């Protein structure tokens, strides 16, 4: 099976470097052109350097001509990227691409993200939604969870330890500020809550930040 | 550089419609275009090249046709995995370039928000900010309104959506509100509201809270 792994991607600075590479097996890598694609935050795919099966041969476009520089080294069936001066709209998921006899990418890798940016780490604020104080209970019942004032992305929310999956929607992050919120809510029979628990569970890995918060009724004064 | 003109952004078929998508390209490019695939959480595949020619392990019923500036994808009869994101790519000449995508969703009965509103929880009120949530969730068709109000004012400042993806187990959509204020702010108005407009009703949703009232 044809295999492209990415590795190298991360958070950096704007006018900082870093250096992606693309590990392949399972083809003949030095038979074949290959091609860096990135897909940007907004989903669009945009085609950043191609090299000839041979490495005598790259092709930029202007977006990053002077800045990115592709390689590969056919005895080690490893395609790389050295990015420098980078800038914010270098932000995506960068792929590894292998061509056919015509630039068409006919396998890719899973990617690897490369986050351009001067915001600061900053950890969540976990804020348990819990229905209007003494509001009058129907047959379901809505809870929800605030991650309010985070960066980078991601987090990971999950309810009851991921035990509670049903029910569930996980809203997009918003940023706003150089900060991310996000919000989920979980909606179960009133016959469950709040006699079962409910605890909205939420890890921030880059600044080290885990913490649990039940959801507990408002009041009772 | 060659600009792909892909179209339509998003639409909504049913379980077993034939769709096709049209790229258009800014100039001729003969047969020399690209269909990718791509799912949710994976990287794009490759469904057709030059123009007509299926990848290998691809399903006959996606095709492609067209040569010169006008091309099309089609899928005869569409299955669930099907309702993703599609692209079109030309390889004529450098710059490479892409279109901007096509996002197939699943139509299904229209279905009313439901819609739940939060106060700030009292953990938030040690912050210099509160912040109120509304919930509208489970609804169809995707396009709906909110509007907040505080002692029946609209407020548009500090307001923040965000719109989840077509749910996977019953195609619905659901939306976030969040209205952020100082907590001084937020001290200073008694009465709270999210107003949910959709095509479902021609009566807006209302949910409201008084501050400090149980
Ligand atoms: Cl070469």
């Known amino acids: 099976e044809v295999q492209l792994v990415e590795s190298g991607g991360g958070l950096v600075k704007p006018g900082g470097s870093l250096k992606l590479s693309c590990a392949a097996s399972g083809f003949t890598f030095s038979s074949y052109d290959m091609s860096w694609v990135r897909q940007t935050p907004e989903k669009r795919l945009e085609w950043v350097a191609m090299?000839?099966?041979?490495?005598?041969?790259?092709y930029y476009p202007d977006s990053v001509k002077g800045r990115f520089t592709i390689s590969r080294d056919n005895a080690k069936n490893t395609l790389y990227l050295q990015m420098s001066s980078l800038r914010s709209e270098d932000t995506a998921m960068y792929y590894c691409?292998?061509?056919?006899?015509?630039?068409?990418?006919?396998?890719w890798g899973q990617g690897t993200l490369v986050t351009v940016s001067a915001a600061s780490t900053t950890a969540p604020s976990v804020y348990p939604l819990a229905p209007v104080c003494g509001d009058t209970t129907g047959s379901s019942v809505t809870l929800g969870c605030l991650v309010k004032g985070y960066f980078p992305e991601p987090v990971t929310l999950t309810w009851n330890s991921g035990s509670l999956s049903s029910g569930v929607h996980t809203f997009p992050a918003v940023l706003q500020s150089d900060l991310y919120t996000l919000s989920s809510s979980v909606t179960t029979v009133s016959s469950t809550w709040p006699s079962e628990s409910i605890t909205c569970n939420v890890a921030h890995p880059a600044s080290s930040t885990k913490v649990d918060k039940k959801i507990q009724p408002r009041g009772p004064t | 550089d060659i600009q792909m003109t892909q179209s339509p952004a998003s639409q909504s078929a049913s379980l077993g419609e034939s769709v096709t998508i049209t790229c258009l390209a800014s100039?001729?490019?003969?047969?020399?275009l690209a269909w990718y695939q791509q799912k949710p959480g994976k990287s794009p595949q490759l469904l057709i090249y030059?123009?007509?020619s299926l990848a290998d392990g691809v399903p006959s019923r996606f095709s492609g046709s067209g040569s010169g500036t006008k091309f099309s994808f089609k899928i005869s009869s569409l299955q669930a995995e099907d309702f993703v994101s599609y692209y079109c790519?030309?390889?004529?000449?450098?710059?490479?370039?892409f279109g901007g995508g096509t996002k197939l969703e699943i139509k299904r009965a229209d279905a009313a928000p439901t819609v739940s509103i939060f106060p700030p929880s009292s953990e938030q009120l040690t912050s210099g900010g509160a912040s109120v949530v509304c919930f509208l969730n489970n609804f169809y068709p995707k396009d709906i309104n909110v509007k907040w109000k505080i002692d029946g004012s609209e407020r548009q400042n500090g307001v923040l959506n965000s719109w989840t993806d077509q749910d996977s187990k019953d195609s619905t959509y659901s939306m976030s509100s969040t209205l952020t204020l100082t907590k001084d702010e937020y001290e200073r108005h008694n009465s709270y509201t999210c107003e949910a407009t959709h095509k479902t009703s021609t009566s807006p949703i209302v949910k409201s809270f008084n501050r400090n009232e149980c």
């Open positions: 100039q001729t490019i003969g047969t020399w």
């Open positions: 030059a123009a007509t």
């Open positions: 090299i000839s099966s041979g490495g005598s041969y790259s």
């Open positions: 691409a292998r061509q056919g006899d015509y630039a068409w990418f006919a396998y």
């Open positions: 790519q030309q390889f004529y000449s450098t710059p490479f370039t």
